[PDB]
Ligand binder design. Sequence first.
Ligand SMILES: OC[C@H]1O[C@H](O[C@H]2[C@H](O)[C@@H](O)[C@@H](O[C@H]3[C@H](O)[C@@H](O)[C@@H](O)O[C@@H]3CO)O[C@@H]2CO)[C@H](O)[C@@H](O)[C@@H]1O
Ligand SMILES: [Ca+2]
Ligand SMILES: [Ca+2]
Length: 546
Amino acid sequence: KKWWKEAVAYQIYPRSFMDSNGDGIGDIQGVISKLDYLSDLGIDVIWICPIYQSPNDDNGYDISDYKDIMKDFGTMEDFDELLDEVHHRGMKLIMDLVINHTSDEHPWFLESRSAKENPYRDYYIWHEGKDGKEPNNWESIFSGSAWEFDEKTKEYYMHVFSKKQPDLNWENEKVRHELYEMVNWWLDKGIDGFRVDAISHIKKVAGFPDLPNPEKLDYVPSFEGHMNRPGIQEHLKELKEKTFAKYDIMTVGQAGGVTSDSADEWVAEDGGNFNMIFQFEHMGLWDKPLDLIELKTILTNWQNGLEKINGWNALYLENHDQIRSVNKFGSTAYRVESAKCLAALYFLMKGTPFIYQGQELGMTNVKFDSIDDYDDVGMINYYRIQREKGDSHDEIMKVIWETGRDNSRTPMQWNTEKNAGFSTGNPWMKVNPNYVDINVEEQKSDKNSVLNFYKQLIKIRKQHDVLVYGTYKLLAEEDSAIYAYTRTLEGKTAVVICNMSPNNQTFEFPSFTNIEVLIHNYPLDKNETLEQCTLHPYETRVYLLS
Ligand SMILES: OC[C@H]1O[C@H](O[C@H]2[C@H](O)[C@@H](O)[C@@H](O[C@H]3[C@H](O)[C@@H](O)[C@@H](O)O[C@@H]3CO)O[C@@H]2CO)[C@H](O)[C@@H](O)[C@@H]1O
Ligand SMILES: [Ca+2]
Ligand SMILES: [Ca+2]
């Protein structure tokens, strides 16, 4: 019923995808050079992370010119070539729309900060201090205060994210008008839509009241002051009417603070802000084995919850903000098996699946010895803030190694040449040493590779409508090792069975005129009875019943 429901999306982090000119930084001509790879994978939609002019304090999410390409990545002519090549391959491109905040080097902010009476002052969020300190006790998501003092005008500006990412004032009609014009300027070029960044953060609680601080911390996590706050829907409804609704595009909103039963306004077919949202509930399961049943509960709540409102799920396990999914949800002791198990698990639920670069190879976390090898502004600021407070170097590195999103930002691993073929120079972030084992070139020619498993997943989803539009139903809910579910559409039922445990397990097949195995990550045992499945660690199978 919709092209974006049937699509499989691939997410490119361009700084780490392909360097075409030896400076160690991925670029647009690098992306163009690998479009055959994404075509051959079977990708329908490419989401490219921000490629706009940026000082790169937050690697593109701090934008200083919305209408110019980041110099590191190329020019508008390179972008025009990329879009032309993508569209001639029958693929689509969505851009990363970043309008909660700008760079502090954006011309609007350079005007805004210059004087209280500057006409751009109210484009951002300014407030006098309180009792000689910040206007309130809110913490930035990147640690430290959510307020930065301006010596010249003697006021603080708010930044939910880095000090170089001042938040835009969405209560200002002039701001909204300029943002809508710029969105439509991009849409007029014929891009196919947007992933909408941090979009849950655009409504701040008026008066910015202090939050509880019983532990007398320096600052306190401030989501209750700015994540999905009452009043946000007025802005998002206007954004949709003034921009997205005028074009045949897809939108996926990155929307924290939305629950599976309160998602109508965000994604309902009748009146939702977006076609689909990224929600974070399944990415917050920290400890000793993974709580499989809590994962079932979360994902099933979203399957059932959006089915009731005619919404649509964005399916994912990886992106540029998370650690690698083999680490987070699988096992490094069963890297290939668990990568495939996880793939079948998340990809075949009802929704639009996203593949993050390297996920299709089973890429895993890195451990660099030195803080100087890392880049993430959030984790570097965390280091500095916590080191100042007396946290030891080793305690801080443990947090960065186990939770830091730099784990997903190491160069894409193309082959076993220098830098895994990502660059002829010195990569901006070092390649994971396991590229000698994990790389596209080796996986292409190995029928058993993670890459070719993803290829077959994409193919079976395209060829069987039940895997796109079939109703989801959780099976065997209480089983602490097996995640199993069905997809049903008329006379076809797909059964997805995943042994999400590092042990052998036995599972009773749910009890058709015909049965077919669509995909499997272990050799099939001829003597095995369908009724009593003897599953190996992280074994997955997908059956098709008529
Ligand atoms: O452009 C700044 C930043 O924005 C994007 O990521 C941010 C999310 O928008 C924001 O909601 C927050 O995510 C947190 C979730 O709300 C919370 O449920 C849980 O998942 O912890 C997260 C805290 O970090 O913060 C992220 C960034 O950390 C964008 O995708 C980022 O790349 C970008 O840096
Ligand atoms: Ca380059
Ligand atoms: Ca067996």
